[PDB]
């Protein structure tokens, strides 16, 4: 069989010399903090997974339901914090940056735990649970309010059987800019939407110049993110995958380190 | 555009 190396010594040879390290992170990193991701092993919200609710069409049809889901997700972050994987990554960035070596995190996650852990060079390619965008005027705003709007207070219960709140659109979250009052939506990239062109340019720049790439906690089923680390590997650059399981991309990489990132990464990035 | 999906 054709399986990548699990030699930490061999990895460390590349790590010691890298001037430009790209770390791609996914839902497995957030899962280690207890964040429910609602895909793969990450559970269900009522009857649904993220693929069912995080879509333009779900939000067209039942914007109260989609906002209930995102509200639940916002509110549970109250009890979720960065883990040893987040900290290994942030500390590595800090330590390497003092030596003039660059570390950039490209994250699929929307829960801002890499920000909270102190990562500075962060590309949030799918947006943020704590940002809104207006469906009419297009302005993006940071929003941490708990609850986001009065009508959502105590709604979002995840239990199967929980009935739709059916909040009238006028009482869901609304633009507060002079003269808009649009419906807001979460500033999150949904299935079926494209990624911001500006961010993808920044991503391609990092991938084209990096000399080592880590893919951490990624199922490597969500595109286009899942295509980033294979592209690096095809330039001959070493790519190490850190994940609890093998994925469809595993055999494209030079290393696979099995386990929770919070166990493997502090060792790898030391 | 460059579009989001899951396999
Ligand atoms: Cl993922
Ligand atoms: Zn607006």
């Amino acid at each position: 069989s054709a399986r990548p190396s699990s030699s930490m010594a061999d990895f460390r040879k590349f790590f010691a010399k890298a001037k430009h390290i790209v770390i791609i992170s996914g839902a497995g990193v957030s899962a280690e903090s207890g964040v429910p991701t609602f895909r793969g092993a990450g559970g269900y919200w009522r009857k649904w997974q993220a693929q069912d609710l995080a879509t333009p069409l779900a939000f067209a049809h039942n914007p109260s339901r989609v906002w209930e889901f995102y509200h639940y997700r916002r509110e549970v972050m109250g009890s979720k914090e960065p883990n040893a994987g987040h900290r290994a990554i942030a500390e590595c960035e800090t330590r390497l940056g003092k030596q003039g070596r660059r570390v950039v995190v490209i994250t699929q996650n929307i829960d801002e735990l890499h920000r909270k852990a102190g990562t500075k060079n962060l590309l949030e390619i799918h947006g943020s649970l704590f940002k809104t965008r207006c469906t009419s005027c297009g302005v993006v705003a940071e929003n941490y309010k708990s609850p986001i709007c009065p009508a959502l207070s105590g709604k979002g219960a995840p239990e199967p059987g929980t009935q739709d709140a059916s909040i009238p659109v006028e009482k869901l979250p609304r633009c507060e800019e002079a003269g808009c009052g649009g419906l807001l939506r979460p500033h999150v990239v949904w299935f079926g939407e494209n990624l911001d062109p500006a961010i993808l340019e920044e991503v391609d720049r990092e991938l084209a110049h990096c000399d080592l790439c880590l893919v951490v906690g990624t199922s490597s089923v969500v595109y286009p993110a899942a295509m980033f680390a294979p592209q690096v590997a095809a330039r001959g650059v070493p790519v190490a995958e850190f994940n609890t399981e093998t994925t469809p991309a595993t055999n494209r990489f030079r290393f696979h380190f099995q386990g929770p990132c919070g166990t493997t990464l502090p060792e790898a990035l030391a | 555009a460059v579009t989001k999906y899951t396999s």
Side-chain angles (χ1 to χ4, degrees), chain A:
Chain A
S1 100
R3 284 276 158 71
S5 167
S6 45
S7 180
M8 189 60 77
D10 297 32
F11 176 76
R12 292 279 288 167
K13 310 194 182 161
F14 294 107
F15 179 64
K17 63 161 78 85
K19 321 275 175 170
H20 189 146
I21 300 184
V22 173
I23 301 182
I24 292 149
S25 72
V29 186
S30 292
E32 298 187 36
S33 295
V35 179
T37 57
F38 302 119
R39 52 177 182 90
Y44 307 79
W45 183 85
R46 301 180 189 169
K47 288 221 260 180
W48 296 294
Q49 288 174 308
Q51 292 66 37
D52 305 313
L53 300 158
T55 68
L57 202 67
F59 187 74
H61 294 355
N62 204 338
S64 166
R65 194 185 288 171
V66 178
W67 266 114
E68 274 198 277
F69 177 60
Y70 284 95
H71 171 74
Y72 175 69
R73 288 174 78 186
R74 285 159 61 89
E75 292 310 310
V76 295
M77 293 308 291
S79 52
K80 318 291 180 192
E81 307 303 344
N83 60 59
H86 297 105
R87 285 193 287 279
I89 286 160
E91 282 163 29
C92 175
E93 179 189 63
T94 298
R95 183 172 83 261
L96 267 53
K98 285 164 165 153
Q99 311 160 14
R101 295 160 71 196
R102 179 178 181 70
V103 174
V104 187
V105 173
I106 296 183
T107 191
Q108 299 172 256
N109 306 322
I110 65 167
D111 55 45
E112 296 188 357
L113 297 170
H114 289 288
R115 304 183 57 186
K116 186 166 185 173
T119 290
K120 294 182 180 75
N121 308 334
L122 182 65
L123 295 180
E124 288 183 312
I125 70 179
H126 293 158
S128 176
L129 281 180
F130 299 112
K131 295 191 186 165
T132 56
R133 186 178 63 243
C134 189
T135 63
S136 305
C137 78
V139 73
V140 173
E142 295 195 340
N143 189 310
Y144 291 94
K145 308 219 316 305
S146 167
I148 192 156
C149 73
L152 277 162
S153 180
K155 306 299 184 172
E159 320 186 58
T162 301
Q163 311 288 25
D164 282 292
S166 313
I167 291 160
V169 83
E170 30 278 306
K171 298 172 80 208
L172 291 170
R174 312 305 303 210
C175 192
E176 293 182 353
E177 293 290 11
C180 179
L183 182 51
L184 300 181
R185 51 171 282 164
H187 181 55
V188 170
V189 178
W190 283 335
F191 297 100
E193 299 184 327
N194 47 343
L195 278 72
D196 178 358
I199 292 173
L200 291 179
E201 263 208 296
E202 293 183 283
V203 170
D204 294 310
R205 179 174 64 253
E206 307 294 348
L207 307 174
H209 306 308
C210 75
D211 53 5
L212 174 60
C213 177
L214 283 37
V215 49
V216 302
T218 297
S219 72
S220 293
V221 306
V222 177
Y223 290 89
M227 82 194 175
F228 297 171
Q231 188 171 289
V232 173
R235 299 211 278 118
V237 173
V239 178
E241 179 177 55
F242 290 81
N243 194 225
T244 51
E245 304 218 324
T246 54
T247 74
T250 292
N251 282 0
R252 305 184 62 185
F253 303 139
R254 166 79 74 111
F255 301 98
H256 171 90
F257 292 114
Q258 215 160 263
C261 289
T263 307
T264 56
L265 282 184
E267 300 186 74
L269 301 182

